[PDB]
Amino acid sequence: ASCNGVCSPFEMPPCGTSACRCIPVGLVIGYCRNPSG
C-alpha cells in the first residue's frame, strides 16, 4: 500500500514504516509521503 496520511515529524518510523518519510508540514505534525511519488 502506498504510504499516505498524517504523522508527527518526531515519530520514527512515521506511519508505522521506515520505508516512508514524514513531511514536517507543521510544528509537531506533518504528513506521510512515500519516497516513490
CA-to-CA dists, residue 27 to 1, 9, 10, 17, 19, angstroms? 27, 8, 10, 21, 22
12 Cβ partners below 8 Å, 6+ apart?
18
Experimental technique: NMR
17's grid cell: 514504516
Contact between 3 and 33 (Cβ < 8 Å): yes
Burial class (CB in 10 A: 0-12, 13-18, 19+), 7: buried
